[PDB]
Amino acid sequence: NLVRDLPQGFSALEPLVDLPIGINITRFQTLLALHRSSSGWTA
Amino acid sequence: PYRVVVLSFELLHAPATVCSTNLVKNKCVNFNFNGLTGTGVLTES
Numbered sequence A: 001n002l003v004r005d006l007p008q009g010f011s012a013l014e015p016l017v018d019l020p021i022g023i024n025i026t027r028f029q030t031l032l033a034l035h036r037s038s039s040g041w042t043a
Numbered sequence B: 001p002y003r004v005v006v007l008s009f010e011l012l013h014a015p016a017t018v019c020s021t022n023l024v025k026n027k028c029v030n031f032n033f034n035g036l037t038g039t040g041v042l043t044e045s
Ligand SMILES: *[C@@H]1O[C@H](CO)[C@@H](O)[C@H](O)[C@H]1NC(C)=O
Pocket: A023, A024, A025, A026
C-alpha cells in the first residue's frame, strides 16, 4: 500500500513447495528480463 | 522365456519417495495421522 514509495512494514511468509532432492547448492544467479519504457532492447 | 525383472533399488542415499480409516468423533480413542500418533477424544473445532 503506497505511503511513501518504499518497501517497509511487518511481513509474514509461508511455505509453498518442497522438493526432497538431497544435493547441495552453493551459488546462484537470476534469469533477468529486458524491456524499455540488451543490445537492441534495453532494461 | 520369462519376464525376469532384476529389482534393484536405491536405499537411503536420498530422501525417500516410494512410501486410512473412518473419522470417529467424541470418543476416547487411539488415532494416527499421516505423521502424528496419539490417543484422545476426537472432536470438531
Ligand atoms: C555438498 O556441498 C559441497 C560444496 O559445494 C559439494 O562439493 C558436494 O558435492 C555436496 N554434496 C555432498 C554429498 O557432499
